[PDB]
Design a protein around this nucleic acid. Structure first.
Lengths: 47, 111, 119
RNA sequence: UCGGCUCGUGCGUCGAUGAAGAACGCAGCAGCUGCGAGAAUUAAUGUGAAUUGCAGGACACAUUGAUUUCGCACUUGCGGCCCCGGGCCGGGGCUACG
RNA sequence: GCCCUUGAAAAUCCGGGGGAGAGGGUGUAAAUCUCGCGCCGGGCCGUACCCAUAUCCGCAGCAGGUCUCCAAGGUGAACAG
RNA sequence: CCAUGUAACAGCAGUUGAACAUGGGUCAGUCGGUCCUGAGAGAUGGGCGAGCGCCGUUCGAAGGGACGGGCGAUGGCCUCCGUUGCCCUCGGCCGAUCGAAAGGGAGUCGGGUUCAGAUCCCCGAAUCCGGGGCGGAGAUGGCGCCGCGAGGCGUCC
RNA sequence: AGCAUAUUAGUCAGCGGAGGAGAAGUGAACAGGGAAGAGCCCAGCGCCAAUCCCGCCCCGGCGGGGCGGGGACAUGUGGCGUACGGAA
């Protein structure tokens, strides 16, 4: 039992839980080395 | 040989026909999603944007020519400076007479 | 010949005019942006989708979220010049809407899919 | 040291034509940032041959020429009025208080 | 049987009473608690899985806590052991 | 969750994993929400309040809706209803609104199918609600010209 | 050096309303010197609706001119004029 808004929030939170693309490490001024990753057990969503 | 707005500056039906052709091309490219087609995705999207922009500009210039001279016109055809600016030289006969009888004079001292 | 039968004074009904605006509040009507090309984004091409195509006579599409079954059916009919038996829809856990369009029995979903480009 | 702090100068411009703020979405291949279904931007003007992490722009040599959601209610719940099209469905415009 | 305890409301659905009315002029007409068939439609959102000695809360794969449904044979009074 | 693959974490280990990586998966008129009001919450009128506001929930010119008739709806050009004002006419207070995935609330079951979905997919058999056909029902009956026709006419009921 | 008046302090917190400025026109004022510098308008009393708002034609702060209808207004609009006086 979910609402549409909760489900959309969950979908957005799911689409953000991926590693960075590797080619971004090759850019000219890149300071990132890895991804704000979230684990369902380690950290809980704001609900 | 992409689409350019000057070449589009044409009747509405022909512009809609070209827009529909572009939409079909974009749908085919999205289904296909080769390097060339994956690059063509952006070209077709921007061409669609260009055609729609030309359509809207032509429609609104025609509307502004239509409503010119009318006292009341749609709100989007009314100037939008700032809510405060959208919300002076009139003088009373008394002040006008005062100005006429006693104008400011040009004068110099010590001469 | 004017006597109040009831001891309750009600507000008498008065004329209510229809609006006759001296100008439209908008110069032009807003263009519809959920047209047929915006309704179907792209067909889903996965093993389950291929099963649906070759066994259920059903095409699997990814569609706009605001589109309903009537709109999806009409958009498919107009875009691919075909007939639709029925449409089932779900909203995927990634937020996209997936539509299973079962075609009419007199249409082969495999040939139609080949025409579209998938399979 | 492409950041602060402090002082000074000029200006001193939000919003129902719908703001500040929030949500969601948008790139050929998460964040920040930029944008709004014309979504990594359209047009125009100036500038002038790049963008770049990776192949992928015929760049007319007159190098036009690279660089949405936040009437009644808040569950996408339920309407009503007038038009338009297809035969109930879809589209457009309206419908807050003072 | 017990109560100095008396154990929801509304949407919604139906029957009855009454009779304003309608129907047709001699072959039917109005009308069907609406009788048997036939025709068309039913949009939107949820739906995976865990549900607890590791999928929830307790800083954790924590001897804690956390609402329910089904539940066989023997012994035995027994959902006891 | 499913499949495939494989340093940190799983207080030993692991060829294993709810870990990591890649890619998939949730299909409804009939199961729920959606509808009702329950305790209650809460607008408008009114009152109070320096004021943001809050008190109050029945304590105010609170009906916008009814088959029926004419002007004008004539519109299909009037079968039936999209047409305006009026009366011949009626329409009280539980005043908007919200409040249950265990209360109320019509109607879907059997078999098969997947790596992961099925009362939702497919096969089959039904059903409820809403919106201009066929049959049946309304029902063939009761002076007198021919007739012992059970023949149709003539008339009335 | 407690503490109640006092002080903290008309200050923090709270509420309302703006503009490019606003407002004004323990313990202060006036005079003096500077920055700046600017003055005015109604009601009322008088004389003469003389006043204002809202289809046709002609010329991106919706105005100007002409022509014709509706309203406001005598329970008072406009012109002259308000203390430095005003009108005749």
């Amino acid at each position: 039992h979910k609402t549409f808004r909760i489900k959309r929030f969950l979908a957005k939170k799911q689409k953000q839980n991926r590693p960075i693309p590797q080619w971004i490490r090759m850019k000219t001024g890149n300071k990132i080395r890895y991804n704000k990753r979230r684990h369902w057990r380690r950290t809980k969503l704001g609900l | 040989a992409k689409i350019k707005a000057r070449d589009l500056r044409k009747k509405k039906e022909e512009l809609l026909k070209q827009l529909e052709d572009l939409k079909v091309e974009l749908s085919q490219l999205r289904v296909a999603k080769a390097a060339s087609k994956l690059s063509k995705i952006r070209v077709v999207r921007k061409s669609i944007a260009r055609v729609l922009t030309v359509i809207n500009q032509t429609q609104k210039e025609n509307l502004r020519k239509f409503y010119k001279g009318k006292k009341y016109k749609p709100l989007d055809l009314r100037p939008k400076k700032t809510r405060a600016m959208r919300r002076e030289n009139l003088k009373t006969k008394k002040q006008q007479r005062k100005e006429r009888l006693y104008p400011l004079r040009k004068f110099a001292v010590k001469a | 010949k004017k006597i109040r039968t009831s001891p309750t004074f009600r507000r008498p009904k008065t004329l209510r005019l229809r609006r006759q605006p001296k100008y439209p509040r908008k110069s032009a009507p807003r263009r519809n942006k959920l047209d047929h090309y915006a309704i179907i984004k792209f067909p889903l091409t996965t093993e389950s989708a291929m099963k649906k195509i070759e066994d259920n006579n059903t095409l699997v599409f990814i569609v706009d979220v605001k589109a309903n079954k009537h709109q999806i059916k009409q958009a498919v009919k107009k875009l691919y010049d075909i007939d639709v038996a029925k449409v089932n829809t779900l909203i995927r856990p990634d937020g996209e809407k997936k539509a299973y369009v079962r075609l009419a029995p007199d249409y082969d979903a495999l040939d139609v899919a080949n025409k579209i480009g998938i399979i």
